[PDB]
Design a protein around this ligand. Structure first.
Ligand SMILES: *[C@@H]1O[C@H](CO)[C@@H](O[C@@H]2O[C@H](CO)[C@@H](O[C@@H]3O[C@H](CO)[C@@H](O)[C@H](O)[C@@H]3O)[C@H](O)[C@H]2NC(C)=O)[C@H](O)[C@H]1NC(C)=O
Lengths: 46, 108, 109, 173, 172, 172
């Protein structure tokens, strides 16, 4: 792996992760969120 | 296949001098910034032994062994040469299956 | 009866929802997840290079606890793995002075 | 939204337009069909893409937690160290969450604004040569063939060319 | 403001409308104020969610802890103080700025709701009424209380009044 | 931009207007540029307060302090370093982001001031002039310099020109 945490390794291109704060290697930035999703498109109609 | 060719085939060096064994890879064995070359020592009449991993760092191995090189060609340097160094030395690459070894170089 | 032109905007079968200050769960046509939530549940090698102490502690390793023979001559490591409360520490009881400062030095090695 | 277009005076989007975000639906004698305004769509794509890339860029100097060990008589600095780590983790989580919430809101209003501008782009060209139906549609006071439709779509409408036949059609009404 | 309505082309608010933020008439049956329930409720929901979101985003804020140190721990004492003040200053900035920024957006949000309400009526009336340019539309036809109610709930039947409107435009 | 005016329906700025940011004519007495003093001063006040508010919000920023440690204090040395870099990185983000965000709002603020200025004139002129659709209104009557000045200071007497305008519309 390229990024390791005490719970397991990370294979991701996400800029954020919520696996565990203590990591080593090229890693996403840890955050305490359950969810981080950006709107890119527009408001969808039903 | 990454054909590994060692040179010279047999090397006789005076005691207390410098043995210089070369390795040449058909294609590079060298990405992630590190070289994935390894040197092995087979003292006569027994299984091979690990000397150098990723081309430069020693595994309980005396400093007399200088792992050097990058890319397509490398070199195991034994200096000073001691008595218990009679062996055939092998370089093997791990950069890409199938794992391939050198012909091997016998030291006298 | 007459020719006409209309201005309008895209829509699709997306169910992806997104949050804002004034509104929650806003279905949107396109969204990008930027939070990674999965790992392989395993300790792994780091860029082709770890020293796993198993049931040994750093003290046990460095002082040479006889139950720690696996590590008599360990190769280069990427990172070091130690259990929370390893069994094989100081087999003969006592103390390791400035132990934490020694673990710190290790972590830079 | 902020600009009254998306889910506003234009009540609904078109499943039918698929080659872009904003565009036109025309209807003449030669037939009807959807078409995306390539220009305003590309502008929005560039804007949103730069936005996404800017958000990810601004976060490269974020805090990175480091393992540190302490003994039973170092409980104070252990706790200080923990508070420091959680401290920054909480700050940066706020920063990421808030940034996403704020720019999401601006993004939705950005699309709303691109649409309202597109509508105005057509309106300011057509003037009295067409009637504002008030739903995003303009009913023409003259004949608009496919080539005429294309001139409205690429901002080359020749208002005075149709001015007379438009004016005459307005006045029998 | 940003959208030209509040303190803009509509120069002033009405003390008289009290059942809402935004709203509307004057015909033969008489005049009176009325709030647009829909746009008002939308704004109330938006602002309320905004307030609740601001208070929500702050639950993981820094909390200072008492810690004691002796005369030979002045360095970590000071480090600890800088750390505490450090976070206190950050979170004070975050609260102050968030309030300033969302206040500005809130005022413009109301401005936008109003401008949208005006446009909602305008796009219905079209040539059936005249834009006085002050938030008022003068009708080209008779608009009884039920007609007033259709404009207010978005069910104006434009073509029903189209003819009597057109005739009244043309003697003008 | 957000409001469709700057680099929008008004495609380009005027090198010629130099006494302000936003402004205005062409009649028989001659043509010339003039800045709308009111909307310009409002924008100047807004931007100046904005700049001053940004610099103000940053006075309680982190200030790094020299601290020394020995070979057996490597842990708190590192803790201290992480703390300092920690705050330096936070405040650098805060300054960079604040500037990026308020820059974007500033450009759209100008766009909005312009679009409001155009609407200010439009709502005065009504059918007394024709929207050319490029920021210009072609008059349906004679507008001398004093008339030009009434449009510019919001005192246009619409009904005074109403009749001569209406007559000129109808031969068209
Ligand atoms: C967006 O909508 C989703 C889907 O409704 C929301 O997530 C849902 O939230 C409800 C609570 O309102 C969850 O119900 C909970 O389920 C647990 C399961 O153990 C149970 O104890 C109770 O039934 C409890 O109420 C529900 O599981 C959850 N669904 C999913 C898929 O996560 C979410 O809240 C909405 N987002 C916002 C901002 O409102």
């Amino acid at each position: 792996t390229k990024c390791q945490t005490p719970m397991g390794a990370i294979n991701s291109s996400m800029p954020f992760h919520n696996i565990h704060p203590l990591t080593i290697g090229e890693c996403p930035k840890y955050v305490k969120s359950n969810r981080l999703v950006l709107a890119t498109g527009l408001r969808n109609t039903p | 296949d990454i054909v590994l060719t060692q040179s010279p085939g047999s090397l006789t060096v005076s005691l207390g001098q410098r043995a210089t064994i070369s390795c040449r890879a058909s294609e590079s064995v060298d990405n992630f910034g590190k070289s994935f070359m390894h040197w092995y020592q087979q003292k006569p009449g027994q299984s091979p032994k690990l000397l150098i991993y990723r081309a430069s760092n020693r595994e309980g191995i005396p400093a007399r062994f200088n792992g050097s090189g990058s890319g397509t060609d490398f070199a195991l340097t034994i200096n000073p040469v001691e008595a218990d160094d009679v062996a055939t030395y092998f370089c093997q690459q791990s950069n890409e299956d199938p794992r391939t070894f050198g012909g091997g170089t016998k030291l006298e | 009866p007459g020719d006409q032109i209309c201005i309008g905007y895209h829509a699709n079968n997306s169910t992806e929802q997104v949050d804002t200050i004034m509104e929650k769960n806003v279905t949107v046509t396109h969204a990008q997840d930027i939070l990674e939530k999965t790992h392989n549940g395993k300790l792994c090698d780091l860029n082709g290079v770890p020293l796993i102490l198993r049931d040994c502690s750093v003290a046990g390793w460095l002082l040479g606890n006889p139950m720690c023979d696996e590590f008599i001559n360990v190769p280069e490591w990427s990172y070091i793995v130690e259990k929370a409360s390893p069994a094989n520490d100081l087999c003969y009881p006592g103390d390791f002075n400035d132990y934490e400062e020694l673990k710190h030095l290790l972590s830079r090695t | 939204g902020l600009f009254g277009a998306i889910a506003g005076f234009i009540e609904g989007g078109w499943q039918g337009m698929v080659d872009g975000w904003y565009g036109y639906h025309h209807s003449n004698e030669q037939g009807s069909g959807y078409a995306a305004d390539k220009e305003s769509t590309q502008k929005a794509i560039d804007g949103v893409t730069n936005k996404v890339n800017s958000i990810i860029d601004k976060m490269n100097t974020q805090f990175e937690a480091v393992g540190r060990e302490f003994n039973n008589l170092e409980r104070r600095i252990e706790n200080l160290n923990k508070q420091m780590e959680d401290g920054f983790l909480d700050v940066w989580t706020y920063n990421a969450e808030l940034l996403v919430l704020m720019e999401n809101e601006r993004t939705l209003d950005f699309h709303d604004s691109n649409v309202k501008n597109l509508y105005d782009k057509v309106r300011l060209q057509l003037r009295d040569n067409a009637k504002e139906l008030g739903n995003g549609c303009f009913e023409f006071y003259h004949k608009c063939d496919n080539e005429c439709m294309e001139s409205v779509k690429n901002g080359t409408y020749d208002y005075p060319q149709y001015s007379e036949e438009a004016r005459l059609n307005r006045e029998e009404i």
